[PDB]
Chain A
Amino acid sequence: MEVDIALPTLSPGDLSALQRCEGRVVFLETLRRHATLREVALPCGGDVLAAMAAYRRRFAAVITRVTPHRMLATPLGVGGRGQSLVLQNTGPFDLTNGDHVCLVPPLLGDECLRLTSANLELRFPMTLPLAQARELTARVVARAAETLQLPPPHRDNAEAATRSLVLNMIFLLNEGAVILLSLIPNLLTLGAQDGYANAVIQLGSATRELGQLVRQPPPPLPQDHARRFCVFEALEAWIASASRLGDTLGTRPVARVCIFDGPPTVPPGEKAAVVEV
């Protein structure tokens, strides 16, 4: 299954540059074998959140062979978990071995490919390690929620991001959440006896502030609690939710890297062979 992307007549001075694109991923809307290039197209920078959401509806595809006639690309993931392939590292950070990778839209709208031969630009995203993609997504969703390399927001689809956030949050409150909350002083008192206990709680955690500014009584006995227990249901719900938080706001890990012999890290602008998971 290799998709085919045809091209129009371009300038001989631009195929020499587009040919240098052999590891960046494209985002197709459907997966018919033959396809055009005009279909896969993106405007310049703007509303990183919109593109991040669009990166879930459309599925990726890695390109491997370019020809001034057509372009052979690989449907990245729909049915395969072992298609060992190579994609270049167009990310800012440096990715070592055994790292799940993630596609994130580019920042500042600075790096695109203005193709004048046909008047259309393709904004190939960047590949970051999961650990830093998570912090990036977190920072952007926090900034979006705030408004009721620094890019501006859009405030047209900020409603959607803050919405998904507050939904995934409101359905984290539960009859057992109050029982788990009525132990915050009992946790803070442990935050002084042990050092790791103070470690696990951050500095401005907005709970160690709460811990001294109110008091709470023992939680009232709920209904049927002689039969059912609630803290376990709450904990299970939280595991099930948080296991799927990082996806619904950012992008799922698309694949992971693996090497045999050479240097661990692959600095940017380099080809790295990855398995697909």
Chain B
Amino acid sequence: MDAHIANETKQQMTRFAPALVHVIVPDPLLARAGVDPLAPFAAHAQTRYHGSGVCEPWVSVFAGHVQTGAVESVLTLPPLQRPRGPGGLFVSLPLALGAHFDGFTTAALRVGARELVFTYDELLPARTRYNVDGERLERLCRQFANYARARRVAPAVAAAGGHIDALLPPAAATIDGEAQLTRGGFDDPAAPHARDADREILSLVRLTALDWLDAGYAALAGGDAPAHVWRRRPVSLVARRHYQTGETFVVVAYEHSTAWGGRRGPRGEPLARVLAEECERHGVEHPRALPAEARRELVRRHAELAVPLGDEEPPLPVFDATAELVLLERFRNACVRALLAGVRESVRREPRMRQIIEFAIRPRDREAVLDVAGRAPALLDAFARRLEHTPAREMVDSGLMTAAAAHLAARATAGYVTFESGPLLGGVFLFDYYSAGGEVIRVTRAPLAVAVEPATRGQFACRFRGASHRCLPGESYAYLCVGVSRDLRALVVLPGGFGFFATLRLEWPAALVDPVLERLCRRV
């Protein structure tokens, strides 16, 4: 919970975003996202508007990953009980809103390697759940009473225990966090007025209660501990789902907090309202197919809905929760088309490939190199099939898209810096291996930074700094070696050292370069 407080203060003091939101991503979500807990964290986040492709520069946020039960750590105090259940990292994302918070505009999170997306329409719930926290708090105070009565620690707390006793029943207590997401119903801002308006008509037809806990409990731990104070003020956690992977995660909001929810937190009407009204009014089934003379009034009203409606073809598909997925899939398709076309052109002419790397082969191994000769064609075919069919989440960390981004970094006309790797310093080929026996699967987790150097009689010499992984190219069997330079010049090294160079021509529009490079670099 210290993470949320730290992020709220860092936001309010500096104003790195209009508003904020508190989130508790549990264990199984992180697990299915491909990221692992219990490892070093480094959190970042950025907000990417939809239909345009303009990404605010990343902002570092404080995240703290609990281990045991997480939800109860928001509800209970240390000395009285211990939490229980699953546990995930606390985090707070920035927003972009204020008048009519636009839908379908995501908030991208970044953890050590992988990125998660959280569509606004999914993050921000209409109604909160503050009515159940009274039921929770009364049990909590009764709990403290039965503790002070029995443990016999100090007199100042004993007096508070006696007061609480004489205030409300001493029956029994227990706090359960899991029961909070199930039992409750959503609180609306009317029902007190229903009770009040019923009061007049029925009547016609004819210290305080909790600050004792505060003053007392400030003596057991001996410390005020401002992080605690919000645990006595009512909270509200609204269990929600996820669009990217289809699991659960929670969006908490504290009363005193200036985040999204609670009190003194900004509220913006869901932009889907006017969209639904005008979709029904003029009588069409879809907002994109709206008559332009009608869309003129919408664009006239709110300066945000403009670009998803005015241009003929927007840079990114609009009104679909899967924009970034389509973008990454198209980028990967382009990179793979490039590489495969390159090796294709270099092998098209009926070749005889010269071993471009020096490797002395023992005299009993003529059989093995003859076997490599026999299986080269099927090996290349299976390699093409594999490199094609693979998904996109697993490819982005590889060297292919790495050097593709390094290539795009020049023509983009704007500076860009990597996250965790020094610039490539062209001349270094980033390798991605592949098994050479039977089933063909990548073996390397991180790319290998080898450096080619022209040597005797046109046989470039290998040497690699940055990584340390034996059998570098073509040294041992069962390793097909591919690698593309910053200049996008690829080579292929079969076992034994045999292979060829190959050029690469990347064919990709220019109107989308800065989006992709904002999503794969830092732009500082």
With a CB–CB cut-off of 8 A, which chain B residues contact A220?
Answer: 12
- Give how many B residues have a beta carbon under 8 Å from the other chain's beta carbons: 10
Q: Is the Cβ of B226 less than 8 Å from the Cβ of A225?
A: yes
The yes or no answer to B9 lying at the interface (CB within 8 A) is yes
Give bound CA distance, A244 to B270, whole Å. 62
Indicate with 1 or 0, residue by residue over A213-226, a CB within 8 angstroms of chain B CB atoms.
Answer: 00000001111111
Indicate with 1 or 0, residue by residue over B214-234, a CB within 8 angstroms of chain A CB atoms.
Answer: 000000000001110000000
Q: Is the Cβ of B9 less than 8 Å from the Cβ of A223?
A: yes
With a CB–CB cut-off of 8 A, which chain A residues contact B2?
Answer: 226
Q: From residue B14, how far is it (CB to closest CB) to chain A in Å?
A: 10
Q: Is the Cβ of B13 less than 8 Å from the Cβ of A223?
A: yes
Which B residue sits closest to A221, measured CB to CB? B9
With a CB–CB cut-off of 8 A, which chain B residues contact A224?
Answer: 6
With a CB–CB cut-off of 8 A, which chain A residues contact B225?
Answer: 226
Q: From residue B511, how far is it (CB to closest CB) to chain A in Å?
A: 42
Q: Is the Cβ of A226 less than 8 Å from the Cβ of B226?
A: yes
Q: From residue B77, how far is it (CB to closest CB) to chain A in Å?
A: 16
Q: From residue B19, how far is it (CB to closest CB) to chain A in Å?
A: 18
Which A residue sits closest to B13, measured CB to CB? A223
The yes or no answer to B5 lying at the interface (CB within 8 A) is yes
Q: From residue B308, how far is it (CB to closest CB) to chain A in Å?
A: 39
Which B residue sits closest to A222, measured CB to CB? B9
With a CB–CB cut-off of 8 A, which chain A residues contact B10?
Answer: 223
Indicate with 1 or 0, residue by residue over A132-159, a CB within 8 angstroms of chain B CB atoms.
Answer: 0000000000000000000000000000
- Give how many A residues have a beta carbon under 8 Å from the other chain's beta carbons: 7
Indicate with 1 or 0, residue by residue over B1-24, a CB within 8 angstroms of chain A CB atoms.
Answer: 010011001101100000000000
Q: From residue A231, how far is it (CB to closest CB) to chain B in Å?
A: 12
Which A residue sits closest to B10, measured CB to CB? A223
With a CB–CB cut-off of 8 A, which chain A residues contact B227?
Answer: 226
Give bound CA distance, A225 to B225, whole Å. 9
Which A residue sits closest to B1, measured CB to CB? A226
> Which of A223, A224, A226: most chain B Cβ within 10 A?
A226
Indicate with 1 or 0, residue by residue over A184-224, a CB within 8 angstroms of chain B CB atoms.
Answer: 00000000000000000000000000000000000011111
Which B residue sits closest to A227, measured CB to CB? B2
With a CB–CB cut-off of 8 A, which chain B residues contact A226?
Answer: 2, 5-6, 225-227
Q: From residue A176, how far is it (CB to closest CB) to chain B in Å?
A: 15
Interface residues of B in 365-418 (CB under 8 A from A): none
Q: From residue A109, how far is it (CB to closest CB) to chain B in Å?
A: 56
Indicate with 1 or 0, residue by residue over B190-231, a CB within 8 angstroms of chain A CB atoms.
Answer: 000000000000000000000000000000000001110000
With a CB–CB cut-off of 8 A, which chain B residues contact A225?
Answer: 226
With a CB–CB cut-off of 8 A, which chain A residues contact B6?
Answer: 224, 226
With a CB–CB cut-off of 8 A, which chain B residues contact A223?
Answer: 9-10, 13
Give bound CA distance, A128 to B500, whole Å. 98
Q: From residue A88, how far is it (CB to closest CB) to chain B in Å?
A: 59
11 contacts between A and B (CB under 8 A): A220-B12, A221-B5, A221-B9, A222-B9, A223-B10, A224-B6, A225-B226, A226-B5, A226-B6, A226-B226, A226-B227
- Nearest first, the 10 closest Cβ-Cβ pairs linking A and B are A226-B227, A226-B2, A221-B9, A223-B9, A226-B226, A221-B226, A225-B226, A226-B5, A226-B225, A223-B13
Given A221-B5, A226-B2, A226-B227, 13 more pairs with CB closer than 8 A: A220-B12, A221-B9, A221-B226, A222-B9, A223-B9, A223-B10, A223-B13, A224-B6, A225-B226, A226-B5, A226-B6, A226-B225, A226-B226
